[PDB]
Write a protein that binds this ligand. Structure first.
Ligand code: KUV
Length: 273
């Protein structure tokens, strides 16, 4: 290890969280992503079975990396004196959903339906594995352009899923729910559904619905693009002010707008190729 197992390429994205590089596993050569996180910057720490002190992100990734391709999987990890290094899957070709919507503008509803459905299945997988992502948004969704499959990235803001209130939050504020803005309290699943409503609005309108705290708290949704009544209803349901008025995942996937979703490969052939 470890600079000998992977050839490192260009930066994909960086920030106070850390830095993510394109890479190749020397022996495959598998496309990977190499994420560096400074220990001094790690806010949330976790423990491994063998009792190793490790960024909670590593704990969460291990818990979701079973095989379901809706989450970018953690292939390996290393500890350095001042940092941790994560080796993650990298689909090629790929584009994140933020860039995709930027290039294409608002998405046709048939395409938004397929993307949104796949995000729901991925988020359901995380919760089934005991993991709350806490930063669901277009930037953190990768599109495998050949297969039409979407994949969740960046669990650096995530937490173990629990049924009691969260009093901390470090995801994206314009995706955070009104109960966080107002009371610095939220429950995991209803906060996730709120962020999913923001995500869906962004897909079909090409921009997010709320920019300021007061707009989040008012909860009035104005549509700047033509959107079907069924889609508008689903979005407004996900963005209910009262958390307990929001739909469950089952209720979202049973919604009239969500019926007859395209398969991922269909999605790619029609909309991506
Ligand atoms: C903060 N954080 N932590 C892990 C990750 N990204 C990955 O893990 C990841 N990204 C991949 C990628 C991509 F995202 C875009 C184009 C091509 C790619 F191959 S492939 C892979 N495994 C991130 N990014 C979050 C925001 C993201 N939009 C930034 F572009 C990169 C930072």
């Amino acid at each position: 290890p470890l600079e000998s197992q992977y050839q490192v390429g260009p930066l994909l994205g960086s920030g106070g969280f850390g830095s993510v590089y394109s890479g190749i596993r020397v022996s495959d050569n598998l496309p990977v992503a190499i994420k560096h996180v400074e220990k001094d910057r790690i806010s949330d720490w976790g423990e491994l079975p063998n009792g190793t002190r490790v960024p909670m992100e590593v704990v969460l990734l291990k818990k979701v990396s079973s095989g379901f391709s809706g989450v970018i999987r953690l292939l390996d990890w290393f500890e350095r004196p001042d940092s941790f290094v994560l080796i993650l899957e990298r689909p090629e070709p790929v584009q994140d959903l933020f860039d995709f919507i930027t290039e294409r503008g608002a998405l046709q509803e048939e395409l938004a339906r397929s993307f949104f459905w796949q995000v729901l299945e991925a988020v359901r997988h995380c919760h089934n594995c005991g993991v709350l992502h806490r930063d669901i948004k277009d930037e953190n969704i990768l599109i495998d352009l050949n297969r039409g499959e979407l994949k969740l990235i960046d669990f650096g803001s995530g937490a173990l899923l629990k049924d009691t209130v969260y009093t901390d939050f470090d995801g994206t504020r314009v995706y955070s729910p009104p109960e966080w803005i107002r009371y610095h309290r939220y429950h995991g699943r209803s906060a996730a559904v709120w962020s999913l409503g923001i995500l869906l609005y962004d897909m079909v309108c090409g921009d997010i619905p709320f920019e300021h705290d007061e707009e989040i708290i008012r909860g009035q949704v104005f549509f700047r693009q033509r959107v079907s009544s069924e889609c508008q209803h689903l979005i407004r349901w996900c963005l209910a002010l009262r958390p307990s008025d929001r739909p469950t995942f089952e209720e979202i996937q049973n919604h009239p707008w969500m019926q007859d979703v395209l398969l991922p490969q269909e999605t790619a052939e029609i909309h991506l190729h």
